Design an enzyme around this catalytic site. Structure first.
Site, short mmCIF file in Angstrom:
data_model
loop_
_atom_site.label_atom_id
_atom_site.label_comp_id
_atom_site.label_asym_id
_atom_site.label_seq_id
_atom_site.Cartn_x
_atom_site.Cartn_y
_atom_site.Cartn_z
N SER A 123 0.80 -1.22 0.00
CA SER A 123 0.00 0.00 0.00
C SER A 123 0.83 1.27 0.00
O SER A 123 0.27 2.36 -0.15
CB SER A 123 -0.89 0.05 1.24
OG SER A 123 -2.06 -0.69 1.02
N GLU A 143 -4.30 -7.23 -6.07
CA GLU A 143 -3.29 -8.17 -6.54
C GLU A 143 -1.87 -7.67 -6.33
O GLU A 143 -0.95 -8.48 -6.13
CB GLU A 143 -3.56 -8.48 -8.02
CG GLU A 143 -4.86 -9.25 -8.22
CD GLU A 143 -6.04 -8.35 -8.61
OE1 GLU A 143 -7.06 -8.87 -9.10
OE2 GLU A 143 -5.93 -7.11 -8.44
#
Length: 272
Positions: free
Chosen positions: A43, A141
């Protein structure tokens, strides 16, 4: 050798790999451990995504307040802000704040689409001189963190250098840099990582990353001491090279939280 020993010991206790790069922007002192190796971004790409939005804001008037009227098909697990505003839409700036400060996954994918996808974000990073960063996939993903897979990776040194360019340097003009700084400062997801190492009366802006493998996680930050030039640093981990379904994971190691904090402490202590 001696400077690295505490990191080597921390890494040996952790069982995986740790990468650290820290720079003091006032003295130029650095701390480096595996700083050129590749680690999954997870992230943490969302901070650079917001910076890419801000780069476009130097050229496209009104981009930040442009509404994006997405539907349920845009939503992804852990999109708490996008779900909350599903029935009204969100502007580009609101999506950027959500991606940076809550790690909102739908917001990240919506912004990626606006910027030409993973290839578009990578091209932006190339444009600021970062030849290491690569984003290849979308949420979720891109979090796969498959060992040896160079997709969706960068290095601690490249992350720190790019972060410095975008917050303190010349890759964005000051109004844009200020917005990026303010988004990072208001992050809510990093209270167990680099921020754990920082004296209370300093300031921090950070973006965390957590991958789909326990022990592969990261954080990068600008740290503002009182009366001293800022420090920019990045701490990345790769999990040690069975799964337990009957318990929630450990809060101190599930995302290498204690290790990241400990490495950040050693980095701040080692500067000089």
């Amino acid at each position: 050798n001696l400077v690295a020993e505490p990191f080597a010991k921390l890494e040996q206790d952790f069982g995986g790999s740790i990468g650290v790069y820290a720079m003091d922007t006032g003295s130029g002192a650095t701390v480096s451990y595996r700083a050129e190796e590749r680690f999954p971004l997870c992230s943490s790409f969302k901070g650079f995504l917001a910076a890419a939005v801000l780069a476009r804001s130097q050229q496209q008037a009104g981009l930040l307040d442009t509404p994006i009227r997405y539907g349920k098909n845009a939503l992804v697990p852990w999109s708490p802000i996008s779900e909350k505003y599903l029935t009204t839409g969100m502007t580009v700036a609101e999506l950027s704040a959500a991606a940076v400060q809550y790690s909102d996954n739908a917001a990240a994918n919506l912004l990626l689409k606006e910027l030409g996808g993973p290839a578009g974000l990578t091209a932006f990073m190339r444009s600021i001189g970062d030849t290491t960063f690569r984003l290849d996939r979308w949420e979720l993903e891109l979090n796969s963190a498959i060992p040896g897979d160079a997709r969706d990776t960068s290095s601690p040194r490249a992350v720190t250098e790019s972060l410095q360019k975008l917050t303190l340097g010349s890759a964005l003009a000051a109004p844009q840099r200020q917005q990026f700084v303010d988004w990072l400062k208001g992050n809510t997801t990093g209270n167990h990582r680099i921020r754990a190492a920082v004296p209370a009366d300093w300031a921090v802006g950070d973006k965390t990353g957590t991958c789909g493998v326990y022990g592969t996680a990261n954080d990068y930050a600008v740290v503002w001491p009182t009366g001293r030039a800022p420090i920019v640093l990045a701490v990345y981990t790769r999990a040690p090279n069975e799964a337990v379904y009957t318990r929630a994971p450990n809060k101190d190691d599930k995302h290498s939280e204690a290790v990241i904090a400990a490495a950040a402490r050693l980095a701040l202590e080692g500067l000089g």
